[PDB]
């Protein structure tokens, strides 16, 4: 041991840091790994060891040299013709859909014969050879048609001859096989939509598509399942008198604004199903709705598919003057989300004419921001088929590197209503979308045109006003869900969709990922976060209860959590009752509303409430709880489909003044939607109980909110937590997931408005499933 100088010390330690870094890099280089493992974990290909074409071209030479260093069937007389029948059917189907003509209905139904299909495809070619008339002759080479049903619902689409009996029970997305190669889909409704990506993308979609600032990417959702109807007034060519009335009948006076007539912005809100038979009006909460208008009179309304069938049935009930237009297989939108989604979307499309909407969209595409733009951003134009490009390329002008809010206000002042609404009129009418397919080419044809440009003359195919299929294209902003949705015809979507993620910073969304996006932005979701409505309550309660009951009876005894014997749940443990509040599974709003009306009957009976000891005399809590258990035991035998139990309050508080016989459950209870954030340690889960702060213990929770902990220096909650009573419950968290954008726990709950006006402070405690701890938090109101 001997003292050294300062400079020699810092030089020796810096040389040691450099030596350790060089040794770590040398160990990482001497670790025997392939160049196949040199790819990122998103791009790793298992079949790249078989064929080299998955590997990047810079790396394929090393892959070839290391792969070199490392190193017509028996068919009977019947199944041969059975195999040749399919090959002949595919060949005749390709020639029939390619040459001139459309599809017969007998081949579409595919429930009679295959020899009749062969004879029909043989007969159509001969009829085209012998004569020009009597032919349903198409307008293009690729087999595209017009699946538009005027005044009736759209039937099962024709699709392809080979993949026809695969569409017998459920229909497909236009990107069905493409999404099927890259995602997990579930079969729930009549379509088959994506559920989750194959590679893990929880935190990935959370960071790139989320509300986080570090969102250097783009996320695309196939939202073709969202069904739209187009309504137009046939009675008068003048101003729309019945349109405002039918909007005020379908929705409330919440979405019938004069502002939405003037500024024509799409609005998403809550629709409720009306029913007027004779002098009586019954209103039930129906679900979400998207309303959009064209300057005064024509309207597109798009929403959830079962709700779409119900709204179409109610609209077909009263169809006296106005003409309805069902669009299930002729128009669909896809949803882009993120910071660079606008840049990739402007990269995917090009211009065919110098217009104002191109200039507005190209300036919007460069700012890389969403919420700084105003509420109305609905752009529409005519563009080229994106099969002309087939390459990831972006187009950006000089623009002198300047972005200010003054140019945004200048685009807000000047809005090209005429051309955008003309594109709207083109997409609503069935004749213009049919005229759009007048020059649709095959991939062989666009490859031949690219070869002609490579021979004559750059990576492009030029536009011709005579023989190129100019499409209508509409890109609009959706406000509360913070995402850009772009709508297009059915057979046009896939040439737009395939070129999207070939931009190297664009990934796809699943339905669980869309639920995560709606969970992150403090928003709401219809199959899960809407329990108040009829269909949401039915689907959520039935499916989650049956799934959880099958899982509970599926697990053996003594390995799962046992819900029957849990000690110390509430203070003063009530007799004939040892379990948790309601059923242990999915949210029992029936239990909550019967207990709320029981506490209301106790408050109407006396100024205070007693604790404990054909309908027996209600004087305390357990008489209400035994009636709850008896009603649950009765409804386990026969399912309930009579009425709802919990509506919302946010439409009732403003106007109806939330006003509420031997009755225990006839008049339902109204709720407001809240989002509570955890201030204490812990995270929430699904189906979580939501309780009041005690008034005797309010100062203790205020001291815990300010601060109290052991003198070590770190936070303490290992203390005697005072247990409140059973009837202090006010709500249910349906969606419980650890909120990564805040660093805490988020729970979407639904609390009573009378209970909300009881406490002067927003401090509300949460309790998980099968866990006997209480965690305080603070809620903010969800105005959705």
């Amino acid at each position: 041991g001997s003292k050294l100088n300062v400079d020699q010390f810092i030089s020796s330690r810096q040389f040691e840091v450099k030596q350790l870094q060089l040794a770590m890099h040398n160990s990482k280089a001497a670790s025997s790994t392939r160049i196949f493992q040199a790819l990122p974990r998103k791009l790793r290909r298992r079949t790249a060891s078989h064929n080299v074409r998955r590997i990047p071209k810079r790396m394929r030479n090393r892959a070839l040299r290391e792969m070199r260093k490392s190193d017509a069937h028996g068919l009977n007389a019947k199944q041969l013709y059975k195999a040749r029948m399919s090959i002949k059917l595919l060949r005749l189907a390709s020639k029939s859909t390619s040459m001139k003509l459309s599809m017969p209905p007998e081949v579409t139904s595919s429930n009679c014969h295959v020899r009749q299909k062969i004879k029909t495809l043989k007969r159509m070619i001969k009829e085209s050879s012998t004569a020009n008339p009597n032919i349903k002759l198409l307008n293009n080479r690729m087999g595209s048609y017009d699946c538009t049903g005027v005044n009736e619902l759209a039937p099962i689409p024709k699709g392809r001859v080979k993949y026809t009996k695969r569409q017998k029970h459920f229909a497909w997305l236009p990107t069905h096989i493409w999404n099927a190669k890259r995602s997990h889909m579930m079969k729930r409704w009549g379509y088959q939509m994506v559920w989750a990506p194959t590679q893990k993308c929880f935190k990935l979609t959370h960071r790139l598509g989320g509300d986080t600032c570090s969102s250097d990417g783009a996320l695309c959702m196939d939202s073709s399942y969202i069904g739209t109807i187009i309504v137009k007034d046939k009675s008068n060519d003048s101003e729309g008198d019945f349109l405002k009335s039918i909007i005020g009948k379908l929705t409330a006076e919440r979405a019938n604004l004069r502002k939405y007539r003037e500024g024509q912005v799409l609005f998403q809100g809550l629709i409720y199903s009306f029913n007027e038979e004779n002098g009586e009006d019954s209103t039930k909460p129906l679900g979400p709705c998207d309303v959009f208008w064209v300057q005064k009179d024509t309207a597109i309304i798009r929403l959830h598919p079962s709700i779409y069938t119900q709204v179409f049935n109610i609209l077909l009930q009263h169809k006296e003057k106005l003409t309805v237009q069902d669009c299930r297989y002729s128009l669909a939108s896809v949803t882009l989300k993120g910071a660079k989604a606008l840049e990739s979307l402007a990269s995917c499309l090009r211009s065919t004419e110098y217009s104002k909407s191109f200039e507005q969209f190209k300036m919007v595409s460069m700012i890389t921001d969403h919420n700084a733009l105003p509420q109305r951003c609905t752009f529409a134009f005519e563009a080229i088929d994106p099969r002309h490009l087939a390459a990831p390329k972006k187009l950006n002008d000089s623009q002198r590197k300047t972005v200010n809010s003054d140019d945004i206000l200048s685009l807000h002042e000047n809005y090209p209503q005429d051309e955008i609404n003309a594109v709207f009129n083109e997409l609503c009418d069935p004749e213009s979308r049919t005229q759009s397919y007048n020059n649709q080419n095959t991939l062989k044809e666009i490859s031949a045109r690219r070869y002609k440009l490579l021979t004559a003359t750059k990576t492009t195919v030029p536009f011709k006003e005579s023989d190129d299929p100019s499409i209508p294209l509409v890109i609009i902003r959706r406000l509360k869900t913070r995402d850009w949705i772009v709508v297009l015809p059915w057979f046009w979507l896939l040439p737009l969709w395939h070129l999207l993620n070939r931009i190297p910073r664009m990934y796809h969304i699943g339905l669980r990922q869309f639920q995560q996006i709606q969970y992150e932005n403090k928003q709401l979701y219809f199959p899960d976060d809407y329990p108040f409505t009829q269909l949401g309550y039915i689907e959520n309660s039935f499916y989650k209860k049956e799934a959880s009951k099958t899982k509970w009876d599926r697990k053996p005894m003594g390995k799962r959590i046992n819900f029957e014997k849990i000690k110390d749940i509430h203070n003063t443990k009530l007799p004939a009752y040892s379990g948790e509040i309601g059923d242990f599974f999915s949210s029992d709003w029936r239990f909550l509303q019967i207990l709320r009306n029981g506490i209301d009957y106790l408050q109407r009976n006396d100024k205070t409430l007693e604790l404990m000891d054909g309908v027996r005399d209600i004087n305390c809590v357990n008489d209400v709880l035994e009636f709850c258990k008896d009603y649950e035991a009765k409804t386990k035998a026969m399912s309930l489909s009579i009425e709802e139990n919990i509506p919302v309050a946010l439409c009732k508080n403003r106007k109806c003044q939330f006003r509420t016989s031997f009755s225990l459950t006839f008049f339902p209870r109204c709720i407001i939607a809240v989002s509570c954030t955890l201030l204490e340690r812990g995270h929430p889960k699904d189906n979580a109980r939501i309780y009041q702060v005690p008034e005797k213990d309010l100062e203790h929770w205020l001291q815990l909110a300010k601060g109290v902990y052991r003198p070590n220096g770190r936070k303490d909650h290992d203390l005697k937590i005072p247990l409140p009573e059973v009837h202090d419950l006010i709500g249910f968290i349906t969606s419980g997931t650890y909120h990564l954008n805040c660093g805490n726990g988020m729970g979407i709950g639904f609390i009573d408005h009378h209970a909300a006006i009881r406490q002067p402070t927003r401090y509300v405690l949460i309790r998980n499933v099968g866990t006997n701890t209480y965690r305080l938090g603070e809620w903010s109101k969800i105005s959705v």
């Binding site: 300062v6 020796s12 330690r13 350790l20």
Partner: protein, 146 residues
Amino acid sequence: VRLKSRYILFEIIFPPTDTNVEESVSKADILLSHHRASPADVSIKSILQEIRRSLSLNLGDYGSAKCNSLLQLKYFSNKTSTGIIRCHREDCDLVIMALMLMSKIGDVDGLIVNPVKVSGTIKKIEQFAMRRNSKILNIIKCSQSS
């Protein structure tokens, strides 16, 4: 299949036992006064022969039999006096308590051993050691600039 063996980082610190010599009171100055230098006869085999003798005289034979199953010094350099000892996850307690009772080397006395980082992987221990030495360079640079 693999083996779950834990690595332990240790550093040799020399306490400045100088009763007649005065002392300067600062952070990076006492880091300079403790992180001085290793002496001349210090190698891998010398530290191993000393720690096996300490394991024998302190912990015994059968405890030394359990400890000496995978008792190896994987990386050590005398210029910085930081070393990494491989061990089992069960006898890591025994290895750290043997590192604590290290009194003196047979050539140089007056030294203490500081076990700093324990992990089941050596690559994160190297990453922690680079960050800890970076913080030492930060303290040295702060006291050197002012």
